[PDB]
Sequence to fold (602 residues):
Amino acid sequence: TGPGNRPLKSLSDLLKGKQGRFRQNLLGKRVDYSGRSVIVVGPQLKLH
Amino acid sequence: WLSAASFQETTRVLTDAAINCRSDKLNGLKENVIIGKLIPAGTGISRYR
Amino acid sequence: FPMMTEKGTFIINGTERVVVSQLVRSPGVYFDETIDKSTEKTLHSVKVIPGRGAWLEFDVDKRDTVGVRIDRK
Amino acid sequence: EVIAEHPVLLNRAPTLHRLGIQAFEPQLVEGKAIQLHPLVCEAFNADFD
Amino acid sequence: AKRIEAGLYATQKLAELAEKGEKLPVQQRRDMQWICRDGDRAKNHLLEANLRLVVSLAKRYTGRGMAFLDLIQEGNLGLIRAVEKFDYTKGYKFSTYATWWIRQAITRAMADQARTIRIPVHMVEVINKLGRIQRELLQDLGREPTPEELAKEMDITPEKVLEIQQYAREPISLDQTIGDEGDSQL
Amino acid sequence: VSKVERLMNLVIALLSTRTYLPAEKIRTTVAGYADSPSDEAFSRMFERDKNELRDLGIPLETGRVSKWDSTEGYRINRDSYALPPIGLTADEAAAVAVATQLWQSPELVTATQNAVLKLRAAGV
Amino acid sequence: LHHLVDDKIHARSTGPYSMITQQPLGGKAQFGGQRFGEMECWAMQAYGAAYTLQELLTIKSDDTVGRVKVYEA
DNA sequence: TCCGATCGGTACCGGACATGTAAAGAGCAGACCACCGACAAGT
DNA sequence: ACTTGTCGGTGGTCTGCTCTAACGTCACGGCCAACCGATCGGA
Fold:
């Protein structure tokens, strides 16, 4: 453990878990040209 | 071994693969997603590419 | 020593903060009963839970032998 | 001029099936909220709350 | 101690007579080898018998960066040095010279091998002195002492104190959790 | 190159710097100091150049790089370099006309000529 | 209620990236990108859109040369 | 056959951040730097 | 005559190594506390 009684992070801890290398950084990433916002209803729009 | 390690029990899978000296052939959805190749389904198959 | 204001908040580093009361289990003796699915018999146990101390547990098993587990041994 | 006939993909988490990601043709609106068609909510499992 | 000194002298004399010397008698060579081996065994026995004071000395330095076993090993090195420098003619017991050397070795090692960014010992001493003076000033004044008071009570410029305080920062970890759950890191 | 070029380049560089430039950077940056055989010839030459500049009158200050830096460099205070403002013009004409008439001592005439040249460089 | 669109709307084309893995940051306060998680990858695989998924994974997140080449193109 | 014990796993987005102590002190030496002498040979 | 490179010196700060003689001798600060299924090493 280090300061605050927090166990140190080894290589296996890098490679394992949901927060590990594989699941967090290889099967899913953050991408450019992307946005996010609240949705409201537009009834005058077409299906496309 | 790449898909098995990405799925669950990374340490055991890596140990067994290292001891067995396995060689991944890189033909599947998960491996091609990981390495950056087109998945072998949909528009990524040889007939359509 | 930090002092609480007249409204129940602490000014720490210029920011008002609130200490939230915590619901915990009071120390004491607690008796529990379970039913085994391998023999269909009732088994009782008691746990002494102190504050800042070792744990003392007594239990009754299938063989009707009362057993104490000092600490977690 | 630039957004005409340029589809964009809309996604709502969690993505439970394919219809959680759908392509739409964008139109500029004056607000700050995305206007969604009322008939694609069931596919997205989305409500306006 | 006498056995150690006799063994060392016998080894040196045997080495001197080996090169540019003379054919030693067989019994003389056997006796020299026996004395050397006895001296080595006596040194090992003294070391092993005194490998309990080291733990007592290192018990007091626990929780200051280094681990307990590392402190014990550095104390063992200090004990080896103390055995090498112990003189029996003065009549003092081994527990004083050994204590001095063990404490010196532990303190020096903890000065070196305890920081990710290494600071020389001559500056670690200054940092510790500044901290002690700050504690004394805090006790005396009743309030937190300003750099002015430390400058007067440490006979240094009121600017070097800022550099000393800025050299004492320890780097934080990039792997520490940010949120309440375990999904965020610094 | 030329000694005069080295001196002029050093003066300009030490005038335009913002922090205390160390001698190691002076060797690589200032032209004319990079042709020395070894580090001792450069050191002695730079010491002599500093002595000459300080004796001339140009303010050459030596001080720390910065608070948290133990390196020691050199600068030239642009504010102490000279005094811009000048007085009237009619009195200066009389002063120049009487600057030197019959003095023969080389130090006196050189000093008067230097003062006249500086006055001309600061207006008439 | 304290849920206003002014605090929710966010968009990005190119911004800061991470250090170990050269992927975009996250959060409105850091001009970060939107996560394309594993479920979205499953949806893309089920659709059969190989090229969209490939470009999303490679040239929008990690391909260091690819990002600048795409912007120039 | 029963038996404790270790080891694996437990949905998604949005956001949110940085620690709290030291028992000291001295004598001796090499290195680099800022200031200087000579000094003959080269300019 | 002026410059310049090799030689030699004084003084100062940062860094590292060595030494100090009453007697001293076998660590702590602290949970763990879900709850499931699978499986190897015991009994």
